[PDB]
Every structure is written in C-alpha cells, then in structure tokens.
C-alpha cells in the first residue's frame, strides 16, 4: 500500500508518533515521503549487503531479520517482511526503538538531509487530524 499524506499522518498519529521523543508529526510524514515515498513495500539494498524495508526503511543489519544479513542483530525481533505490510503497526513500533537509540531521527539519512531544519509542518497542513 501507497498511503495518501493525510491518511499516513492519521495512522502515525493513531500509533503514538506525534511528539514521540519530541518529534512532531510532520517529521515522521516527511521521513516517510523521502524514505519510501509512502510505499509500505519499498525495499532498497545497501552496499554493506543489508536491506531497507518499508514505509520508514528499517535496516536488516540491526532491526529485523531477513535471512541474508550476516552478523545482523534483529533488535525489533521481527522478520523484515512484516515491515512491508499494509498495516504499519510493526513499522511504527520498530521506529520507536530506533528513535530512542541516541541519534534521535538522525538515524534516517533522508530525514537528516531533507527534513531536519525545514518547515516539516507543511506535511500535515490540510489534514483533518
């Protein structure tokens, strides 16, 4: 599934992401936009051999198990296929342990480089939230 902007924000919102660890909802929506461009099935292979999966492109090296990332850690205790699901429940949760790590949202290169310091508020403008 390819979410609509207001539709992704409603759902992220529903799942406790608005101001989760002080990151307002537009950060999360922006992050989503530039990482998967709102596609729950976006996958991307990295140089190191690891893969980015889903709406927020969670990496297999640390957070999920994909059967093909040697000395991968599976921190969110999930098979990475659960992150490509229509229901972003597993992606939000797994992202909550990520953001909590130490680098806030700097964990997502796309946020750092295209969201960070921008009017991330424009991402939820017009949404009946």
Which technique was used to obtain these atomic coordinates?
X-ray
| Ligand-binding site membership of 18 (annotated) | no
Resolution of this deposited model, Å: 2.1
- Catalytic position from the list 18, 52, 66, 119: 52
Q: Which long-range contacts (CB under 8 A, 24 or more apart) does 86-91 make?
A: 86/1, 86/40, 88/11, 88/12, 88/15, 88/40, 88/54, 88/55, 89/15, 91/40, 91/54, 91/55, 91/56, 91/58
Six-digit token pair at 87?
């229901």
CB 32 within 8 A of CB 55: yes
CA–CA separation, 75 and 28 (whole Å): 20
CA distances from 120 to 33, 70, 72, 89 (A): 11, 36, 32, 22
Residue identified by tokens 């406790």 is 16
CA distances from 43 to 22, 32, 33, 52, 60 (A): 28, 13, 14, 5, 11
Catalytic (active site) residue 87: no
CA–CA separation, 15 and 23 (whole Å): 14
Six-digit token pair at 33?
């936009």
Catalytic (active site) residue 35: yes
CA–CA separation, 39 and 51 (whole Å): 15
- Catalytic position from the list 35, 48, 66, 87: 35
Which domains can be identified in the chain, with CATH numbers? 1-129 (1.10.530.10)
């Amino acid at each position: 599934k390819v979410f609509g902007r207001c539709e992704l924000a409603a759902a992220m919102k529903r799942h406790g992401l608005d101001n989760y660890r002080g990151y307002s909802l537009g950060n999360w929506v922006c992050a989503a936009k530039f990482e998967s461009n709102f596609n729950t099935q976006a996958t991307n292979r990295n140089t190191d051999g690891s893969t980015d999966y889903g709406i927020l492109q969670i990496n297999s090296r640390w957070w999920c198990n994909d059967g093909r990332t040697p000395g991968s850690r599976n921190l969110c205790n999930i098979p990475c296929s659960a992150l490509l699901s229509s229901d972003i429940t597993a992606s939000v949760n797994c992202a909550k342990k990520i953001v909590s790590d130490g680098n806030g949202m700097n964990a997502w290169v796309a946020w750092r480089n295209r969201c960070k310091g921008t009017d991330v508020q424009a991402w939820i403008r017009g949404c009946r939230l």
